[PDB]
Amino acid sequence: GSSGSSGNNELTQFLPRIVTLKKPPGAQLGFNIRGGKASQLGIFISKVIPDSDAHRAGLQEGDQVLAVNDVDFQDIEHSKAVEILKTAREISMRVRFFSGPSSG
Template sequence: MLGMEGRPNYDEYPYPVVFLPPYENPPAWIPPQERVYNPDYNNELTNFLPRTILLKKPPGAQLGFNIRGGKASQLGIFISKVIPDSDAHKAGLQEGDQVLTVNNVDFQDIEHSKAVEILKTAREIFMQVRYFPYNYQRQKERTVH
């Protein structure tokens, strides 16, 4: 089954053959004990599971985070900024989190303005979020707000 140059000959091979590009850019080496905190090495998939966040917002208080995205981007609503030491920060909200629901309202296909209105008027915010940095990056490339 080997061809002329010592490489396999796939002509009679019964399945489709996919040639992958060579692996040219491995992440930089870092000590194993630091890898769990490094996004290039971290394979701790629990980071990407949905989480529940509960925030109480007194009248006139700030949310402690900003959102971007919405129906126009087709990717959803994402947390774009979390103010350090805010209640949102302490509750575990982070940049790159996708907001799945707020107070049982589906946020995966909602207008930006409607999302802002719900977040601003609620006194208590019960959110389902999941960390989704890949779509967050795509989101940033597609939209202005």
């Protein structure tokens, strides 16, 4: 199953956002994913096509992918992360700010 929240909310602070993609007919994600081999690492926005749904969705090299379509992306293979996204008709992963206000 799948459940969400409807209405209206806008309080950016430290909450994970939802980057949903529609993906047009004849598209290909529009970005790559890095991190993940065997250890665990994480699935982050390796690269984003400068003219894709993600680029528009507001994706930025760094937006860590917590989970994708419920499935967690904390301990998953790269290919899987690539496959899932692809296979998955509709992309709906959980991302969140993974960078402080410039340490120092």
